[PDB]
């Protein structure tokens, strides 16, 4: 995927071609202003040296060479501000354009093309990939052009002044260039490698973090913790190897620089003494060529970024490329005028291209006229809602030709049409806009009186009165502060204000009441004369009162006719109607006390790394003083050789000490990180379930914490220590040496040291890897990104795209302008500090000349004070910019100690309480009231009760969200029942043993999630704290006939299972959770919906393997299908949590009650 170069800059205007051209010009010209600085420095020192030999006319010549230095300073000020500001502007504009256009093209797309795309990945796209395009083309091309200029100027100066030396410097410069390349590259790709190192274990944490209730429910904690440990240790080995190699490469860069000084001066003295050169030409040639070779390395990261951009641009410019078959926008679409209600289908088929192997609808030939209200009767399995979407031109039907009133849909406007067929779907969703905005999505132009009229028609207006700020009532995400019945009433209200030409309902009475349903159906019937309508509902209540009732079976229209026709027809509708009638503390060093030896060695080697800058100051300003003095050629030669060798030795000790400080602080940091992750996880797990379900303590929150804040705390301890001591060695010694050698210049230079430090930090913060803040502040246009994609479905309701493109435009055009202001600021700062470097030369050497011509100090002493304090301050900067922050890392450690301190209620590992010897198998609940403390505003269970006997297969029947699965959390002790008193065998579970209460019993959850293991480590997960004895494992697959599928799979007991077992089909996996609980041999088996997705003959075998032990072990089945309810022992009906009637199947059926109605779905 290569976008080359021309395609990459396609989204540009005139002004930006202009910005780029003036940019590279001012970058080439800010480039060549270091080598000219060394060309002046050469002759300046060549005049200081020879001056004071019979201080006449020194201060004059220095008043001249103050103007060369200050001139180049005030030329770089400008060239650098121009380069930075102008390239950040080219990029700013170009990325804004591409971002808005990407979002615009992501709302034009065939619904099928969202089968290919995803949700989380697509948000990764529209933030990470676009910021990655920005990253290259913004400034890396500036920095790249500037460093190429400094290289070529380095060579031109070094060949103008003297070649015989620049050839040697150059002939070892390939190794300098290469080592600079590797150093800089390692620096840019440091954070990215780390995440790659953590990937697996991180993904293993998320899975377990999400499904925590399950891995509680079995014995599975120790397994999940060892599982983690293994991949953690792999992250540690990869980590410390990376630390070793990072430091080797850095240490060898320094060794090579210093050995390069050694060669240059050992050769330069041969030349100087021979007569040819002087000390000025050698300083010039050497510094200019040495700086040029080193700079090229800085250019290399810029080259890699361009490869990254013109790669990611492939996929982004892809969504920009293709036009969906059914153009959602499409202004060329035909528009009808005399649109009378008609509906025409003929031999209609379709498959959801997410599965094109199965053709689910295998024929439909339908003709419906105006006002004709049609219902569709048939099981879940026929495919009504498929037709529903197919009508709205949300797809192309494959066979036949669908039309409406003469002309066909395939050639006419989809916005207009998708409109005039107003729909409500099965599970409509609620937006986090203002309530009146949700509604007004009927039209850009709507009046408040219309909203009032429609909400009094739908009769969803009482709760409209009840809420605060009757027309300002803020809903949150998804609309879950209020009820679900009101939620369906207002989805109704929306497809009502949409005022369509046809009204298509898909079960708009999901969890709604009766009287509101009747008023809603009457208000519907108010608009069913001139506007065609069709209802897709299982609730027969709003089904009987329509004109036509048609019958699906196997996705085909089998039974045709009106009500009476289906009565006399003996189809499916006949049987149906027949049976229906914070405070942060510092205690954090103590988390890493075990590693005192690494720290001792580390502080020692950091002291020495710090001191290695003043040692160079002295040695350098002495190998210069040698050529200033008046000596023999023998003394000049011997001292050149001695100081060359001291240059080599400083290099070697630099190598070894960097390698050690790096390796050692690295290894202590990795070890702290690993034990902190493992221990914070072992304390996450044992915590309760209330702590887990609590909002603000979620799966995203917790994985971010456990995958970052551990590494943050690592940063605080070791980094703070290494940087403080290295800097104190460096600059403390620079300034003390400086006061001793010089008594007047160091005082003037202390007034510049702060600015030099700041200059070093700003330069390194750039080359290191300056990132954008929007990637954290911008948040995703706020929350318009996720919402548009996540809740993409009610946008699969109407068009209402523009009203999202434009909300994007606002919430994204605000920060944009703040980014331009930030470009101007960063430009001025990055120029002003560099300019301060050049004016540092000028001020320090002019004052040095005034001191030297009054015999208060020498040229050795001024070259010492200069080099030591100035480049000591610069190196204080360059090193303090690697230091991780200390506000964040301290708050982070507060969070970690917070968790590692938290004491979960009723410790899962605890044997404290009551440990009984005799067990019977009774369960009794008395006035047990409960509400989930996570919902303090809705009380969910209002004090039910039960009585259980041995082997008593207790039927629990109710609705969805009203007390079928809430005893999973009362009996297995997740949420303590606040009101009531429970009797399991008459024994209070509040004193019982918890890892035994779940040890004794085992259930089949509402859904099984499985894991990253083998079926030998997935079923066998059914029991733990006991070895897997396979003669039990062989038969757990056998009792449920699931031994068949497994032995056919390769690696019969060792076939790989990926994440959540995404390989097999349902019929083999839902069999496994049962096979899971078959090795469990639970004395009480709380089964919930073991007949959701299974064949009817293996439902027999799971029920018999349940049955062949349904004696003697207490049983309880909670499900919809009556295949398990009539063969259950007792029944207890549920309606919003209240227990009304109980009893035997022959007793609750002799009375016509509610269970008479709960039989009436499909039995007959």
């Amino acid at each position: 995927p290569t976008v080359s170069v021309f395609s990459m800059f396609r989204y540009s205007n005139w002004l930006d071609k202009l910005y780029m051209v003036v940019g590279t010009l001012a970058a080439i010209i800010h480039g060549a202003g270091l080598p000219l600085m060394m060309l002046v420095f050469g002759e300046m020192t060549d005049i200081f040296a020879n001056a004071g030999n019979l201080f006449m006319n020194l201060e004059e010549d220095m008043t001249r060479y103050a103007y060369y230095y200050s001139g180049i300073g005030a030329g770089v000020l400008v060239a650098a501000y121009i380069q930075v500001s102008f390239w950040c502007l080219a990029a700013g504009r170009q990325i804004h354009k591409i971002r808005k256009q990407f979002f615009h093209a992501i709302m034009r797309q065939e619904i099928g093309w969202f089968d290919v795309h995803d949700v989380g990945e697509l948000n990764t796209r529209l933030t990470d990939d676009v910021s990655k395009i920005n990253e290259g083309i913004g400034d890396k091309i500036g920095m790249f052009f500037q460093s190429m200029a400094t290289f070529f100027t380095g060579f031109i100066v070094g060949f103008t002044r003297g070649w015989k030396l620049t050839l040697v410097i150059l002939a070892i410069s390939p190794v300098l260039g290469l080592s600079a390349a590797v150093w800089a590259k390692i620096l840019s790709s440091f954070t990215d490698k780390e995440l790659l190192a953590y990937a697996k274990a991180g993904a293993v944490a998320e899975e377990v973090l999400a499904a925590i209730r399950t891995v509680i429910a079995f014995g599975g904690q120790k397994k999940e913790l060892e599982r983690y440990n293994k991949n953690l240790e792999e992250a540690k080995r990869i980590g410390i190897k990376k630390a070793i190699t990072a430091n080797i490469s850095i240490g060898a860069a320094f060794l090579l620089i210093y050995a390069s000084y050694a060669l240059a001066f050992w050769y330069g003295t041969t030349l100087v003494l021979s007569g040819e050169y002087s000390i000025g030409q050698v300083l010039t040639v050497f510094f200019s060529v040495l700086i040029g070779a080193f700079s090229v390395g800085q250019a290399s990261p810029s080259i890699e970024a361009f490869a990254n951009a013109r790669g990611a641009a492939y996929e982004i410019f892809k969504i920009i490329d293709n036009k969906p078959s059914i153009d959602s926008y499409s202004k060329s679409g035909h528009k009808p005028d005399n649109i009378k209600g008609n509906l025409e289908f003929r031999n209609v088929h379709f498959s959801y291209p997410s599965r094109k192997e199965v053709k689910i609808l295998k024929g439909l030939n339908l003709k419906v006229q105006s006002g004709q209200t049609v219902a569709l009767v048939g099981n879940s399995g026929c495919g009504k809602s498929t037709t529903v979407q197919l009508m709205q031109r949300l797809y192309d039907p494959t066979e036949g030709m669908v039309s409406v009133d003469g002309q066909d849909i395939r050639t006419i406007n989809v916005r207009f049409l998708r409109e005039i067929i107003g729909v409500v779907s099965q599970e409509p969703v609620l937006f986090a806009t203002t309530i009146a905005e949700n509604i007004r999505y009927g039209r850009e132009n709507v009046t408040m009186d219309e909203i009032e009229k429609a909400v009094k028609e739908a009769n969803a207006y009482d709760f409209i009165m009840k809420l605060p700020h009757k027309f300002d009532t803020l809903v949150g995400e998804r609309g879950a502060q209020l009820s679900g019945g009101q939620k369906q009433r207002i989805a109704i209200a929306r497809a009502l204000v949409r005022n369509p030409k046809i009204l298509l309902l898909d079960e708009a009475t999901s969890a709604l009441d009766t009287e509101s349903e009747a008023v809603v159906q009457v208000a519907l019937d108010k608009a069913r004369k001139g506007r065609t309508t069709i209802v897709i509902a299982h609730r027969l209540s709003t089904v009987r009162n329509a004109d036509v009732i048609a019958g699906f079976d196997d996705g085909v229209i089998v039974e045709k006719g009106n009500h009476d026709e289906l009565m006399k027809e003996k189809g499916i509708y006949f049987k149906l109607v027949t049976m229906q009638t914070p405070v942060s503390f510092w205690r954090i060093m103590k988390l890493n006390l075990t590693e005192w030896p690494y720290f001792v060695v580390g502080v020692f080697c950091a002291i020495i790394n710090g001191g290695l800058q003043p040692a160079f100051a002295i040695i350098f300003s002495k190998i210069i003083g040698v050529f200033t003095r008046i000596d023999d050629p023998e003394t000049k030669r011997q001292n050149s050789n001695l100081f060359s060798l001291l240059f080599l030795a400083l290099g070697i000790i630099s190598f070894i000490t960097f390698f050690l400080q790096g390796f050692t602080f690295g290894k202590a940091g990795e070890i702290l990180t690993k034990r902190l992750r493992y221990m914070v996880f072992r304390s996450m797990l044992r915590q309760d379930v209330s702590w887990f379900d609590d909002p603000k303590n979620t799966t995203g929150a917790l994985t971010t914490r456990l995958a970052n804040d551990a590494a943050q705390v690592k940063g605080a301890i070791g980094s703070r220590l290494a940087v403080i001591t290295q800097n104190i060695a460096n600059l403390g010694t620079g300034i003390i040496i400086s006061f001793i050698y010089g008594w007047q210049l160091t005082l003037l230079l202390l007034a510049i040291v702060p600015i030099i430090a700041i200059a070093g930090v700003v330069e390194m913060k750039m080359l290191s890897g300056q990132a954008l803040k929007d990637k954290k502040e911008l948040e995703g246009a706020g929350k318009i990104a996720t919402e548009a994609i996540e809740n993409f479905r009610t946008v699969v309701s109407l068009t209402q795209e523009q009203k999202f493109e434009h909300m994007y435009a606002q919430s994204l055009q605000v920060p944009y302008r703040n980014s331009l202001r930030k470009a101007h600021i960063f430009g001025i700062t990055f120029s002003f500090t560099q300019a301060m470097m050049y004016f540092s030369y000028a001020g320090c050497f002019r004052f040095g000349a005034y001191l030297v011509a009054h015999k208060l100090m020498s040229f050795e002493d001024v070259l010492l004070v200069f080099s030591a304090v100035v480049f000591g301050a610069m190196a204080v900067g360059q090193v303090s910019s690697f230091a991780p922050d200390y506000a964040k890392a301290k708050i982070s450690a507060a969070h970690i100690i917070m968790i590692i301190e938290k004491t979960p209620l009723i410790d899962s590992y605890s044997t404290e309480g009551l440990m009984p010897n005799t067990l019977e198998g009774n369960v009794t609940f008395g006035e047990v009231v409960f509400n989930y403390p996570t919902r303090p505003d809705i009380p969910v269970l209002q004090g039910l009760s039960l009585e259980v006997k041995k082997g008593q297969t207790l039927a629990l029947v109710g609705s969805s969200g009203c007390g079928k699965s809430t005893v999973v959390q009362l009996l297995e002790r997740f949420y303590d029942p606040l009101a009531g008193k429970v009797l399991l065998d008459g024994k209070e579970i509040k004193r019982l043993n918890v890892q035994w209460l779940r040890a004794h019993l085992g259930i089949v959850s509402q859904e099984p999630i499985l894991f990253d293991c083998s079926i030998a480590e997935n079923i066998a997960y059914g029991d733990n704290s006991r070895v897997v004895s396979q003669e039990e494992i062989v038969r757990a697959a056998k009792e449920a006939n699931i031994h068949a599928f497994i032995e056919s799979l390769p690696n019969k007991y060792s076939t790989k299972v990926g994440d959540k077992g995404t390989q097999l089909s349902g019929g083999q996996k839902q069999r496994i959770a049962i096979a899971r609980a078959l090795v469990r041999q639970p004395h009480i088996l709380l089964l919930d919906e073991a007949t959701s997705a299974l064949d009817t003959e293996s439902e027999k075998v799971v029920q018999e393997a349940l049955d062949k032990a349904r004696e003697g072990r207490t049983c309880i089945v909670i499900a919809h299908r009556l295949s398990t309810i009539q063969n259950a022992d007792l029944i207890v009906v549920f309606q919003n949590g209240r227990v009304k009637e109980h009893g035997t199947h022959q007793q609750l059926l002799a009375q016509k009650g509610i269970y008479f109605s709960m039989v009436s779905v499909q039995a007959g």
Partner: antibody
Amino acid sequence: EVILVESGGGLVKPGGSLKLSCAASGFTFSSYTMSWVRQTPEKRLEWVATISSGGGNTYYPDSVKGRFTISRDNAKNNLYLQMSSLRSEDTALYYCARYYRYEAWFASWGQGTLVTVSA
Amino acid sequence: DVLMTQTPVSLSVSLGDQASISCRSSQSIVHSTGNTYLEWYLQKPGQSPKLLIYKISNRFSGVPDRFSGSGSGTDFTLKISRVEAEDLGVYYCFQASHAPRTFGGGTKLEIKR
């Protein structure tokens, strides 16, 4: 101009020891190489010792090594040569010396001081 | 090691003429660095020598025009043309390019009258 003037001198029995000085003024003493030079009774010069500006680089001819030790004080501008175990061939006249910047070896001879060793 | 002969020992010049002095070193005095150092110190009577010519052809600042040193390989001469009356004394050719820095012999200059 520069003046170098020395003292010391006189008469010392064989195997003796003494210390010739050389106070130099006028030329910022802490930079130049210095030398001693010796002129025997036949008016025939000879080199004796040299010390570099730093002070940590002294060169003596092959013969008179070990028993003569040259050194300097840069703070007071003085150059001392300390002689011991002198023979009967040490009767001489010793001069200081300076060092021309363009490689001219002895360029500013101070006045002489003479040293006679006899029983 | 390096020893320096000086060919004319005693010289009989007449005031107003040209005189020549020669200094032969065995061994081709030439340093490692590439120069040859060979001064021509001149001492008067009752005086401590003064420099006259350094690095074979140069003249120490403050010398007349007529002292010309010329040096080929291992033989070096000094020519005084138009001999004045304050140019009497003894000449010394001191070489410093090798390990014991010798001072050579000594040639005397007498003006006839």
